[PDB]
Amino acid sequence: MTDRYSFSLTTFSPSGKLGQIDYALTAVKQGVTSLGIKATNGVVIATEKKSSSPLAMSETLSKVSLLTPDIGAVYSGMGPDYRVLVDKSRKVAHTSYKRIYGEYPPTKLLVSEVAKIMQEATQSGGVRPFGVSLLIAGHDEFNGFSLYQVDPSGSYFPWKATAIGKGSVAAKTFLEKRWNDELELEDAIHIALLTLKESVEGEFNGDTIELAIIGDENPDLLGYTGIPTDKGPRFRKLTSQEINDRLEAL
Amino acid sequence: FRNNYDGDTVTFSPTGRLFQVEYALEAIKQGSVTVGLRSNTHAVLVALKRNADELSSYQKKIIKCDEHMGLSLAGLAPDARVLSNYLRQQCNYSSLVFNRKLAVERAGHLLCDKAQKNTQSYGGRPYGVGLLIIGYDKSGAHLLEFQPSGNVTELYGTAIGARSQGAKTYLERTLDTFIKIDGNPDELIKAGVEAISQSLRDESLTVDNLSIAIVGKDTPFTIYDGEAVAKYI
Amino acid sequence: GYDRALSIFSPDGHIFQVEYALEAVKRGTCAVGVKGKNCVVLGCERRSTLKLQDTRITPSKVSKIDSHVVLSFSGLNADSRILIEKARVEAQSHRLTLEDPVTVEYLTRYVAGVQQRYTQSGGVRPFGVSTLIAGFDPRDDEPKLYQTEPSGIYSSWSAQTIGRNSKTVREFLEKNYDRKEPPATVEECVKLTVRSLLEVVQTGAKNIEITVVKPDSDIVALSSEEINQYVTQIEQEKQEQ
Amino acid sequence: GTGYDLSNSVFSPDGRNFQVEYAVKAVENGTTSIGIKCNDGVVFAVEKLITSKLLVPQKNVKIQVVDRHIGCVYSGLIPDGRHLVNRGREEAASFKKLYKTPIPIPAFADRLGQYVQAHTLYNSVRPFGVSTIFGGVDKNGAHLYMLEPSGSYWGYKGAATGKGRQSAKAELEKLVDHHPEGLSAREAVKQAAKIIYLAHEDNKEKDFELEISWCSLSETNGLHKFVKGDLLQEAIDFAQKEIN
Amino acid sequence: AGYDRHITIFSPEGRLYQVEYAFKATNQTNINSLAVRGKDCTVVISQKKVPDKLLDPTTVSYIFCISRTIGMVVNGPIPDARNAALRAKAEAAEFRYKYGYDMPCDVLAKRMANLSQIYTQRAYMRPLGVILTFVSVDEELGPSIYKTDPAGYYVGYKATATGPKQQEITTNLENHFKKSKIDHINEESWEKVVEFAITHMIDALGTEFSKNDLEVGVATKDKFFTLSAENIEERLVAIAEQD
Amino acid sequence: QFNPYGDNGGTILGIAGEDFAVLAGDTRNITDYSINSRYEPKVFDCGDNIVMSANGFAADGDALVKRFKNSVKWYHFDHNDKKLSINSAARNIQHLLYGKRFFPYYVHTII
Amino acid sequence: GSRRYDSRTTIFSPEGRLYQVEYALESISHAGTAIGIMASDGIVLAAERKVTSTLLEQDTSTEKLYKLNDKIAVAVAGLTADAEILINTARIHAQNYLKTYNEDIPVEILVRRLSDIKQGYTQHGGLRPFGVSFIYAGYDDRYGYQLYTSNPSGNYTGWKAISVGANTSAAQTLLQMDYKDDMKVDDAIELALKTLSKTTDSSALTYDRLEFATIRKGANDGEVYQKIFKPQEIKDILVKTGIT
Amino acid sequence: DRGVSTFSPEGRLFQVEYSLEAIKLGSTAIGIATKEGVVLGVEKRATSPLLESDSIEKIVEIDRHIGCAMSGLTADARSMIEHARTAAVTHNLYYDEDINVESLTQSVCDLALRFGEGASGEERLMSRPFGVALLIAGHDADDGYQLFHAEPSGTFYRYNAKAIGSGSEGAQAELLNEWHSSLTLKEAELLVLKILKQVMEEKLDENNAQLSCITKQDGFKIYDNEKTAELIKELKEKEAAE
Amino acid sequence: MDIILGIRVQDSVILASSKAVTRGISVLKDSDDKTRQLSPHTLMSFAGEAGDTVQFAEYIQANIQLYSIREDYELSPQAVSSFVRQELAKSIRSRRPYQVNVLIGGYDKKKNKPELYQIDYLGTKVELPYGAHGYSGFYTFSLLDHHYRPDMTTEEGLDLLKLCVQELEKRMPMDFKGVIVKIVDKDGIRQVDDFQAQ
């Protein structure tokens, strides 16, 4: 019934600060650590699966999501706000792009669409900003591999490597020492696992760690053969088994 | 205390009171006194009119709604215009669509329902007027009292406005007498003028001061002012 | 959607949002208009705070509403554009339905009506703008000068000023403008306009800008050198005492 | 930091909606009304305060009908109760329009429930200042319900609300134990008159008027019907007989 | 400096107090519920408290039949619980009509948790003070338990418990699944799975139950149903003979 | 295809003298070659000493009369029981008729 | 209702100022400085990135300098998210104008429109204003090279040289000191970098902290060309001026 | 804050009562009804001597038989007059007659309470009441010469004589004593001039005060400045005589 | 239909327009000016459906005049004719389309060149040395193909129109009551007072 909230809930304070955006960023700091690293032949996004109960099934809850065959997303902050953003980000990729051009949006443009949705949450009547920072990793033919961060304000930045959430300060330092412009993808996954260990207090294995890549095209993940131009998704979520292998020699 | 819970009608007080509705009730208590009373054949309204100066006219208190129904007002007149207009339309609808003279009881239920919607929704204020509705439908003479809370009571006699407690006590004592005044409209008006003067603490009732309305068995709703009311002074 | 009543009555009987819109006008740069026998002159001050402006492209305070009517303003610059546009649309609309350009009084009444409308509508604040509307009615050689304010009130003036230090310049015109015998020449009328702005603006050829409207759509803004010449003559009058 | 009771939809720190609790106070302030469920129907009764000799007897009817088989009675703000019934009347007509069959009582109860609950979800609406006792006879027997301002409702053997809810419930619970194999429609009507008189001790300074209605498979053909004349006098005399 | 606790906007700390205060509302009714998975069934148990002898016990229920396959147990006040029910029923029917197959348990949960997240972001809607537990035997995933809260959070479970005395039941179950190693009840028939759930509620809450103290809902292949007082009574005889 | 109009026959007459006027009409109502009614009044006293008749399609006639009668009623409510002069009634009827200029009343009307 | 939580974003102060516009301008005074200098043969746009990291990718980065048209470009000060919303409408506006008149939009017309949108959020709608200040650099066949500035109030002005964001007061005096009307573009490049270098809150002015652009007529082509300097190109021009 | 249309504990609407205080700050306006016609007079009150006084329009024609005088926030009156005129002309289109003065006033007052924030009942899109009171004077065949005072409360009184604005309390006391049933038009014109002269801060002349009347024969006329000057000259002589 | 003719010569655009207004069997007027001035250097003639014709012209005129006041600038004939096209292109797909055919005659002060544009009710624009709407074209197009040179003086251009008007008067069935002729050049728009017997 009658929505009487047609006015802004995020306004400027005498100091110039936008209260609700700042507080949203405070919620992101409390959130579990997630990171992203860009190698020469791929990108890796990683986070910890913080389970709410040992009776809960962590497989049913994905912190890493596929947005397009070539684009994936991870977050720090409020889970539910992320889930609904993922749904909208998947839809906008179709409505605002694929239905027009018959192909998937490049990483920068889908990021731009995601940011717009979050900027609206800053200015529209009767809403609060989203309480999440996103890391979006992806590939497109003309840009190659890219990695972006999207803040509650709707701002986005391109990163060689970065971390968000709890231990982001220490993790950004650890990445600065280890990142170079000549990293191969298997090297990048190695760093990703090492950086995430400093954050994780408890069990460190493929059941408590979520990890996905943007790499080579995967024809066996396509589901069909026949069209030569269709080569398969570059987004791949690593299995619990695949993570453990790199942890035995870590 | 009252500070916080009187901001709008939508808000309940800790004791269960709606202060905005109660303040609207206060406008009626400031309004000039009016009296209703009925027998089995006729129903009567007697109203005391108020002026601003001795250079001003006295504001009209009685409104006709249909040939068989009408009402008197105490409080905000613009609100009484809004409500009487509505009741006119409802009477109009009943005649055109069903070829049926709207029952006085149903008129009350409709006014009750219209007042209610103002008492529960944000933004809108309550109405600030009380009404005394007299009619003659298929089941004899009727008299109704309307309060802007929504409450509507069917009565033999009643009064609303300032000092109206005097007139109401008179009717409560004379109940057995005036109810038997059947087929003699004059002797029912005589009882109404005697009722209203029990609420006169200030002035004498004059020829341009007094207003009377009657409906009944063979009498369509008619208003009397000026030299018409002279014989009841 | 948004319909919150922003302009409302207060216990003492004032609309505070309208009262504060007047304060915005008092902050704006001074504007003055004087009418002669056969002309109207609008004078406006330019701010000196930043001396790096590009005058070619910077919006000027004197706007043409039609070919025969001009509008100057004091207050919030951004607000003035809204009022100007509406007035310019109504001007073309009036030529379309009536087959005749607007009278100065009509255009004033329309602008004043818009301003008033923004003082008793939900969800909107009053215009922080007062205007001077000047010109010549179609086929008429009698000069017209009008003023409007945020409340929506309007009236005609022989001479008027608005904005900062307008108390000072109004005081000047009250003891310098003769209604019996108005300024006879265009040159005589422009001199008085510059004289009044010299009371509130310190020596500035850059600072004072003048526009002269004559009968039958003859509007021309003055160059800096032309205005500078008026200043040069006026300042030599004082030293004679 | 307080002020949790100033706006409707707001949760207080302990998890409550204070504005609904304030509506409950308006109900407790009101006239007492009851419902008895019997072996083939339901009986409704209500107290009517006679403020003055001037109120015409039998004329200010409180108990209302939805459709032809449902009866409703309420304590608290009468206009609110009237508004709730206007909704119920629209709601039942809509149901009959689409499914042909008249609305089942459990179905109708939830229709009121969702509507009253809706008025606790927004700050732009006021909660309902009524408790509503209602029921009737459908495809599978009699049903009796009570609806609170929060939107909470349950099925009842006997229901009571308003001023004299304490006296009423105390007397209703004695009936459940004294009549374990059900009570007849005739009996319940007479017994309903007693409860109303006994709950009038709470408001004993004023004179009152009794109003009763019933819905029964065998006595009224499963339709809502008011109690009049000889049957009502019989119930009034029975209540007077058990007071001395 | 005050009003950030009345509507759903962030506090300086990054917290939504109205969501936190809605969680508090879920425990108002002082009722504990638990859900467990069998080999090919799913069972919900909820405490039935009828304190008033004027009530009709058959109408006192916090277990709802959402669709032919899906059932829902609610921890929270009934008007909010029934609100959530009516929506779930509507959403389940609309899904079947639009997509031609029955809405899965995990999908209905995600949907209801999305709606819960909206009230969490938009100011004119208050959160519902309820925790929803959905159960079924999905035609792809098998026996399922999914739980949604006023935060809009949802996850799958091996088993779960909800209410004031939740932790007793939670730890009790946790200890069993470390002992049994498998993540379900290794039993063929649902009747013996219902018995397990009642046994484990007794040992966790330290209280015996009668047929009127319990409420039971069972989900099997292509069917969800709630047990009558007598079905529970029969089930209560079985545990008395085992001890 | 549905035809919204029909023809009910009849005929009406109106003559005015010095201090009086008359309005007459047959009481027969017909459809095609059948007689619907032998006595169906078609001339009505509308109040304020105005007689009215609309002839042609009876359902449009009855509607018009009914709408004008209601117009008289509201005029009294709005203008302090002022008598509606015949010239005023005429202009008022013009607006009723022309208000349905694009779905006309198939009547010839006389007051 | 909601009256309790309304900031009233579009109201005057007793002084006659717009609260939100004022606070938005304060917000911008914290944003990285941007400078625009108009010369006789082109325009320069220089901007200072804020809070840079070594891991931040500059090649794919574009946060302060945006292309609106084939002939118009902007420098941004303030919320980047807010700016992109406006930048998109501006791009649409230029295209609408082109589709209507078959001519590129005159710079001032594009500026007036954006400035009109910003003014709207000031007078109606009860929403917060855009926390953005723009410098516009453009060219058309009427006024040639033009330089404009617009702030949250919707006010716009025309400049020969201007600065937005942090330290404008200090930046404007330095420009007023060194700017002359008959400036060559290569001289205007130096002035822009020198001014930034002096007003920087950082230790030194480096390539990874700068966005740089020019609008210049073809040194052989005869028509207008935009150039958004690449990191390596800025590193080159920063060694030239004498900052290294 | 507090709702716009909201009752006080005393039983009055805050906005309406505060609006009445704005009218008390307005310029004086006087109406006198006689059997030869109704007379309407206003104080111009120009804020500066540079103001062109005859551009102050506080007397307006509604129809040939109905005139209006305003007091208070006079910018608020424009849309009221526009409504009034349209009502009058519209009535003549439907009914081929002149609108009654009583019915015209009622139509103007119907607008007065149409303020709020998206309310129940009908549709009321206006943020505040009008900050202006009106004196409506005219003639019709039914009730003859009439003077109405229309308030932002939505209620209207008929007056034999009425003063509104800043000088209204002192003026109404004077009008109480002076008015009798058998006054001539010229006596009334001189009377309006006599009271305005008293309550004004400035000395009264043909520039800062305006006269108008409505008669059956010539309808509603606003007196030119040369005519009013002569009545001021005539009033000076009569006061000096006794 | 009405006669609507245009011809671009060396340094001017010449527009000739039919003077008659005929409805039914009566010639109601023989002195009708079937043109509007859009700006000091741009002139538009028009022909088509009875009402649409003047309403469209005056509507376009108000918009170009509004642009001039706002911008303190005059749109080039190319810009004006694109605005007109798009309004017609809009209107042809609306509920009731403007049935108006126009000619835009303008002198571009920036380019120092005369310009003529033919635009029909569908929104079909084209720039031409000479143009005609209606049946008129069936005679004048081939005549001008023969006689026209691109460097003709304004005096030569008027002679060339007289040759077109003589042909239309001889061969066309309708009495169009002669023409009103206007010149558009660098000095603005003027009317040739004597053409009827020049």
Short mmCIF file of C-alpha atoms in Angstrom, two decimals, chain G residues 12 18 36 50 67 69-70 90 106 115 119 121 123-124 151 153 167 193 201 216 218 222 234-235 239 241:
data_model
loop_
_atom_site.label_atom_id
_atom_site.label_comp_id
_atom_site.label_asym_id
_atom_site.label_seq_id
_atom_site.Cartn_x
_atom_site.Cartn_y
_atom_site.Cartn_z
CA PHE G 12 16.15 27.41 1.77
CA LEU G 18 20.34 25.70 -0.24
CA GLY G 36 41.03 23.44 -17.78
CA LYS G 50 42.87 10.37 -5.71
CA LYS G 67 34.37 11.90 -23.82
CA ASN G 69 31.04 14.07 -28.02
CA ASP G 70 33.46 13.84 -30.92
CA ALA G 90 24.73 14.27 -21.98
CA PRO G 106 26.94 23.70 -29.83
CA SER G 115 22.97 22.35 -15.73
CA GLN G 119 18.83 22.53 -11.06
CA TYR G 121 17.04 18.14 -8.07
CA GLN G 123 13.79 22.69 -6.67
CA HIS G 124 11.55 19.60 -6.70
CA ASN G 151 28.31 22.79 -10.02
CA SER G 153 23.30 24.12 -7.99
CA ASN G 167 42.32 23.79 -3.51
CA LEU G 193 50.96 20.78 -14.73
CA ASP G 201 48.52 17.41 -1.12
CA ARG G 216 43.48 20.64 -30.75
CA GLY G 218 44.73 19.19 -36.92
CA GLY G 222 42.23 21.06 -40.60
CA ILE G 234 52.13 11.79 -19.63
CA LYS G 235 55.43 10.42 -18.25
CA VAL G 239 59.88 15.17 -17.97
CA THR G 241 58.08 20.61 -18.20
#
